[PDB]
DNA sequence: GGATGTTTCACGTGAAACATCC
DNA sequence: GGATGTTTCACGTGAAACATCC
């Protein structure tokens, strides 16, 4: 890790619009972990940022006039897929934004589940029933990221038949999880 | 510490999370401003107050609905720096068991704060408060299992109240037993 | 009665088990 | 056979219930 001006490191154009809470940031501010870069393909001897955007950020409010990075060459994908791991690592994302990200790995980077999952450090079993909300009716999205059911009740009704009719009886009966198991048990599937 | 209508008081001219204002508001509502607001005479009205310390809670009593807020008329000690500095501390999140443990039996002695003021302010239960504290009761040994990771607070909690408890510890670990189980080991101590 | 000490257990998570597809 | 789709349920947390102290 070779030590770098604040100046000579840029946010990367490519990997999508990142914004962080204040809050987060300005404790962190006020809070030596290298910040992963490569070679910036707009200038010459300054670097770009591949990972650690937040750190950078944190840095810049507590004054430092040198950073520690850390480089490595990667390609203008490599870039955008460490970009999307970051992202799903950071505690922030809510559940649909975290299958998304899971649905593009495995799309457009062609990644296995069991790759996702040895790289973001949850299980398979995760990852995939991440991704099967989106196959979810959009009223019943709209329930979980209100806060009215939570992962563990649509992952439940999922495989179900008139979810929707589920998620009215499950909110309006206040069932738990263990209950929403039991309905949609003894409930036809499609 | 004077009640004092909400609506006489004003912020210091020279971001906080709503779920975290949401909470407070609701322990406010049940428990109502269990910490005074630290307050000074208004430069710029004549009969008001500027707060000097407790902007949160003040946010959190309006939310609320309260129609008096308590104050007291004080300055910032050296100890209300120190008590300030702990209570952000924690809210931080960053810190372990053990650090959040001393964090609550200082603000509890020291600072001579209720446990239920405790957790109001720092948006956990009672009981979390409580149970979190009985921690350092423990022996080192089992303490030290704690950080390792080779119990959980659960396990750790369900113990304190044994005689023994190393040897439960060892039980726990050898046998690879869960919470619930340990929770019967130690429910079959004789007293 | 209200602060503190301790136990009990319903909860959603999370991943192992099972089922189906490629 | 190994990726993917889905269900089942053991787990620790967390807070209400219960117990004890002043």
Redesign the interface.
Known sequence: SREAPIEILQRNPDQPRRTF???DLE?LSN?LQPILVRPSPDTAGEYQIVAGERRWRAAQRAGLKTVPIMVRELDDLAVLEIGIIENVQRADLNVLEEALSYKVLMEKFERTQENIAQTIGKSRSHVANTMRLLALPDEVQSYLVSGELTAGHARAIAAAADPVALAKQIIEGGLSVRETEALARKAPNL
Do not use: A, F, L, V
């Open positions: 809470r204040e809050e404790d809070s």
